[PDB]
Paper text:
HIV-1 reverse transcriptase (RT) (hereinafter referred to as RT) plays an essential role in the viral life cycle by reverse transcribing the single-stranded RNA genome to a double-stranded DNA copy. There are two main types of RT inhibitors: nucleoside RT inhibitors (NRTIs), which act as chain terminators and compete with incoming nucleotides in the polymerase active site, and non-nucleoside RT inhibitors (NNRTIs), which inhibit the activity of RT noncompetitively. NNRTIs are a group of structurally diverse compounds that bind to the non-nucleoside inhibitor-binding pocket (NNIBP) located ~10 Å from the polymerase active site. NNIBP is a hydrophobic pocket that emerges only when NNRTIs bind and induce conformational rearrangements of the residues defining the pocket.
Compound 25a shares the same central ring and right wing structures with K-5a2, but grafts the 4-cyanovinyl-2,6-dimethylphenyl structure of RPV onto its left wing. As to the Y181I RT/25a complex structure, the mutation not only removes the π-π stacking interactions in the left wing of 25a, but also introduces steric hinderance with the linker oxygen and thiophene sulfur group in 25a, which pushes the inhibitor slightly away from the tunnel. This unfavorable change in the NNIBP is mitigated by the enlarged contact areas between 25a and the more closely placed side-chains of Lys101 and Tyr183. The recruitment of Tyr183 by the cyanovinyl group of 25a is reminiscent of that observed in the structure of K103N/Y181C RT in complex with RPV, whose left wing has the same 4-cyanovinyl-2,6-dimethylphenyl structure. The ability of K-5a2 and 25a to recruit Tyr183 is particularly significant for their function of inhibiting the polymerase activity, because Tyr183 is completely conserved among all HIV-1 sequences and makes direct contacts with the nucleic acid substrate. The repositioning of Tyr183 towards the NNIBP removes this important interaction and destabilizes the binding of nucleic acid. Moreover, the higher degree of strategic flexibility of 25a (because of more rotatable bonds) can make it more effective to preserve or even enhance its interactions with other NNIBP residues when Y181I and Y188L mutations displace the left wing structure of 25a.
Residue numbers in the entry:
A (entry chain A): -1 to 554
B (entry chain B): 4 to 213, 227 to 428
């Protein structure tokens, strides 16, 4: 007998105050009981479970299940109640590697560690909570009662404790073999390296020698998968990676969940297929929870889905990461708040792709959206590669300089250069900092009656130009914007405008180029037509001329 | 110091479960080396999957330094840790620190590593060194000793600190020494010349009692509420008068007796914005009376140590930033203005991050606590970048301003 080290046991507790499960065993057929007795008998001789006396007051129901052609019975212990009462664990399997961050590996071996799983002992003081009972034939004897000595499959802590125990086991081997990489994927262990096949195979044999120290035997996975590996929805080829095939289904009738798995396939495909768009398909969902509701595709969603078929016509592949070369991210404006990007090191061979959609808001502009896209790509790139990429953006250096030096908020984009790929992001208007000499001065105001929704909007100017327009079904805020719109409409290319509307200032000072309010959009279109606009604010009802005169005109 | 002080969380509160944010490769490598040697020195230990808690960690470089420093963001654990009435029901904040001519700040956080942490509480200090691209599981640690940046560390260590100082303290009984978290604020009313020696003899005083060579020095003779000033002009345009009346209308929320009636009547009619308006002497008198009102302090402004301090910041352009500290609107306890933020003439966010740290430092000196910031920046931009320019060992709270305040013009 060769002495083997024990696997260090993880201490486990129930949630504070809670006790172990006490669930009654359901009645079974005689044939199922006979099946469960044989299964547990062999499990017992393998050390997985152990018979217990009648003092244990806990119980978890056990079942017997079959399969179609598999003509045997399966054991199943339903630990749902115990899982509700078990402490939380550090789930160390949260995020997976992204293939675009992986580096080429000449050779990769697959090891089966499924039987090493049962060498992981369960905390002695917790075993009592895993008790279960095989009912007896005809209920004429006491049921056979067992408890687990190993990590039960289906128990809350089993995946985290298993992977943590293997990682601790493998830690010295990985650290003293820096020229190999090891990761664990369910019952599979994958070992890659750039060594010639001779030295690689040696490292594998050394790994088996290392795992024997804990009594773990690791044969290579049966029925060797020849490349590519089907892993986490990807195809990992020796020099390329891509998602598994994306197949858009043909349909003349789509309901809201046919589109929601369409959105998921496209969202999945968008990490390598460039230019994928999903807004017009996603907008077709918002306010419904009944998934069988057939919704007609808009003409804009058929167009969008058609364009996605054209990008999905041919498989495309991403390259793996070369740390010796630069990391570059390039962004394009797509329209309707949508943006796409490619991350690459050499031209025309993308590591990955992606998309960004503008946040929900009343008003927005392209520069703010481009900035948000940059921050998202920055954060994703630090996750995948540990560094910020160099950016190529469709915005002139002079445009960005004007924006951030005048914007009321602090803002920042990391190292980037202009790429001349239309449509270019630009500033569509810029208000003046000082009043314009020789330009007509419009004093604007609007008012609406809260109960009747009747209102007025208008202006008076230093040249005696005047206007008041009556309005129905309106609010104070809308009439204040209307008044500004009228002044812009009726003035020459340069104009000074005086308002008391804090609401209108707050909108315009946010520098929107698009809005969900058609009135704001109309104001934006007027601002684009002007050469110079100075917008000045004054407090209301303080006797300021021009403003006091127009306030009288519009306040009934 | 073998006896650990028992520590608990607030009633009905679990430990922190804060996600670790992504780190660059060079910050990960720095944290690996730092934590490897901390583990060798017994300050931290590896932990298992039965610990589900987490507090974020990153790496910084302190002022004028190139050695990486580990910074733990204990903000969540701090608000979940029991209130600490140390050995007293409290230390009254030294109201004289903000009056000294010179205050040097000394990083004494390394002293915390001499005191072991309550073994039942260690699990709540769990943190994770992440790996790039999730290619290995994060390195999980917990603290065995008082960690830098934790609320309990200065409280539990203070009795040990009171005695380390008091030989120095009775030598120089007019030197005010104040402790906030990992930092010691040593203020002397003597000119810089022998202040540095007095800090250096404290610096060697401590090392004889079991450092970091480093100290940033402040001069709080400055710290007041900046006055509201009005323009002094010989010719006023309609636009000038309009801006003045708007500023005075805003000031009238703060000061009693501000009047704009006579100044408004100068704007009787519908005049071009650029037209010059001669001031009547009624308007001049009214303007003069407002000037006088704005010379006096604001009525009934008092610090209430039970309420939060609020700090607002405005970007004024050209590297200039204005800020106000208050607890109640229009009752400013302190206002200020900054210019020429070092090492960032082309980085708004770096400038804002440095402004936040300097305002927080001022707030520590004056009140002994950090303010809650209202930051003029989008959340996603701030969150992506502020750790890149952070140089302090504490971290305040902040919220984001998404609508442009009209009042930026009035602090202009
Ligand atoms: C090593 C490994 C394997 C898999 C597969 C699971 C399945 N099912 C998944 C991950 C995340 C792995 O983990 C790492 N993988 C890499 N790189 C990869 C390795 C695989 N190749 C593909 C390939 C290579 C060689 C052959 S071959 N010629 O041997 O047949 C066939 C296919 C692409 C890059 N890098 C790292 C770094 C730290 S972990 C880790
Ligand atoms: Mg009005």
């Amino acid at each position: 007998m060769v002495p083997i080290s024990p696997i260090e046991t993880v201490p486990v507790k129930l949630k504070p105050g809670m006790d172990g499960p006490k669930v009654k065993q359901w009645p079974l057929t005689e044939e199922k009981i006979k099946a469960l007795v044989e299964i547990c008998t062999e499990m017992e001789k393998e050390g997985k479970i152990s018979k217990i006396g009648p003092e244990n007051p806990y119980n978890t129901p056990v079942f017997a299940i079959k399969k179609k052609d598999s003509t045997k019975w399966r054991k199943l212990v339903d630990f749902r109640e115990l899982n509700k009462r078990t402490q939380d664990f550090w789930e160390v399997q949260l995020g997976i590697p992204h293939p675009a961050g992986l580096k080429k590996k000449k050779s990769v071996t697959v090891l089966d560690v499924g039987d090493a799983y049962f060498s992981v002992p369960l905390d002695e003081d917790f075993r009592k909570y895993t008790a279960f009972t095989i009912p007896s034939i005809n209920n004429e004897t006491p049921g056979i009662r067992y408890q687990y000595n190993v990590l039960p499959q289906g128990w809350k802590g089993s995946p985290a404790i298993f992977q943590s125990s293997m990682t601790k086991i493998l830690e010295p081997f990985a650290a003293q073999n820096p020229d190999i990489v090891i990761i664990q994927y369910m019952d599979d262990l994958y070992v890659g390296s750039d060594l010639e096949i001779g030295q690689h195979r040696t490292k594998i044999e050394e790994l088996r020698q290392h795992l024997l120290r804990w009594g773990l035997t690791t044969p290579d996975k049966k029925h060797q998968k020849e490349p590519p590996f089907l892993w986490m929805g990807y195809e990992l080829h020796p020099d390329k990676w891509t998602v598994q095939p994306i197949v858009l289904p043909e349909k003349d009738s789509w309901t809201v969940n046919d589109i929601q798995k369409l959105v998921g396939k496209l969202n999945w495909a968008s990490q390598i297929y460039p230019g994928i768009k999903v807004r017009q398909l996603s907008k077709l969902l918002r306010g419904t929870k009944a998934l069988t509701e057939v919704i007609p595709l808009t003409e804009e969603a058929e167009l969008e889905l058609a364009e996605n078929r054209e990008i999905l016509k041919e498989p495309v592949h991403g390259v793996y990461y070369d740390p010796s070369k630069d990391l570059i991210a390039e962004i394009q404006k797509q329209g309707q708040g949508q943006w796409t990007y490619q991350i690459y090191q050499e031209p025309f061979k993308n590591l990955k792709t992606g998309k960004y959609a503008r946040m929900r808001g009343a008003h927005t502009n392209d520069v703010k959206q481009l900035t948000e896209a940059v921050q998202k790509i920055t954060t994703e790139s630090i996750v995948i590669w540990g560094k910020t990429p160099k950016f190529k953006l469709p915005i002139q250096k002079e445009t960005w300089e004007t924006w951030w030096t005048e914007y009321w908020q602090a803002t920042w984009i990391p190292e980037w250069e202009f790429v001349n790929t239309p449509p270019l992001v630009k500033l569509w208007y810029q208000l003046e900092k000082e009043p314009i000499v020789g330009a007509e001065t419009f004093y604007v105001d609007g008012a609406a009656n809260r109960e009747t929704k009747l209102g007025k909007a208008g202006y008076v100017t230093n040249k005696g130009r005047q206007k008041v327009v009556p309005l129905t079904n309106t609010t104070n805020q809308k009439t204040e914007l209307q008044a500004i719109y009228l002044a812009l409409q009726d003035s020459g290319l340069e104009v000074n405008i005086v308002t008391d509307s804090q609401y209108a200032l707050g909108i315009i000072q946010a520098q929107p180029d698009k809005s969900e309010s058609e009135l704001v959009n109309q104001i934006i279109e007027q601002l684009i037509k002007k050469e110079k606009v100075y917008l000045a604010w004054v407090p209301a009802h303080k006797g300021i001329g021009g403003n006091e005169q127009v306030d009288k005109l519009v306040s009934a | 110091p073998i006896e650990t002080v028992p520590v608990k969380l607030k009633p009905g509160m679990d430990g922190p479960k804060v996600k670790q944010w992504p780190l660059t490769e060079e910050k990960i490598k720095a944290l690996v080396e730092i934590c490897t040697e901390m583990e060798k020195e017994g300050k931290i230990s590896k932990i298992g999957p039965e610990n589900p808690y987490n507090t974020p960690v990153f790496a910084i470089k302190k002022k004028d330094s190139t050695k990486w420093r580990k910074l733990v963001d204990f903000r969540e654990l701090n608000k979940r840790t029991q209130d600490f009435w140390e050995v007293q029901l409290g230390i009254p904040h030294p109201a004289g620190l903000k009056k000294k001519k010179s205050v040097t700040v000394l990083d004494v956080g390394d002293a915390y590593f001499s005191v072991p942490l309550d073994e039942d509480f260690r699990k709540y200090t769990a943190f994770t060194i992440p790996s790039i691209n999730n290619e290995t599981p994060g390195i999980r640690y917990q603290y065995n000793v008082l960690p830098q940046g934790w609320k309990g560390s200065p409280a539990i260590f203070q009795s040990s600190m009171t005695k380390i100082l008091e030989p120095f303290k009775k030598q120089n009984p007019d030197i005010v020494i104040y402790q906030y978290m990992d930092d010691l604020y040593v203020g002397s009313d003597l000119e810089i010349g022998q202040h540095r020696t007095k800090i250096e003899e404290l610096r060697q005083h401590l090392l004889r009692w079991g450092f970091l060579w480093m100290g940033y020095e402040l001069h709080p003779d400055k710290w007041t509420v900046q006055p509201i000033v009005l323009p002094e002009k010989d010719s006023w345009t309609v636009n000038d008068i309009q801006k003045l009346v708007g500023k005075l209308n805003w000031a009238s929320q703060i000061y009693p007796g501000i009047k704009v009636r006579q100044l408004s009547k100068l704007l009787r009619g519908t005049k071009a914005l650029t037209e010059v308006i001669p001031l009547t002497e009624e308007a001049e008198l009214e303007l003069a009376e407002n000037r006088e009102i704005l010379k006096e302090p604001v009525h009934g402004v008092y610090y209430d140590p039970s309420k939060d301090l609020i700090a607002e910041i405005q970007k004024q352009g050209q590297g200039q930033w204005t800020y106000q500290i208050y607890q109640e609107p229009f009752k400013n306890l302190k206002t200020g203005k900054y210019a020429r933020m070092r090492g960032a003439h082309t980085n708004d966010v770096k400038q804002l991050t440095e402004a936040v740290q300097k305002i927080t430092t001022e707030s520590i000196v004056i009140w002994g606590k950090t303010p809650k910031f209202k930051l003029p920046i989008q959340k996603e931009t701030w969150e992506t970048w502020w750790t890149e320019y952070w140089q302090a060992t504490w971290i305040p709270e902040w919220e984001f301003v998404n609508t442009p305040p009209l009042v930026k013009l009035w602090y202009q």
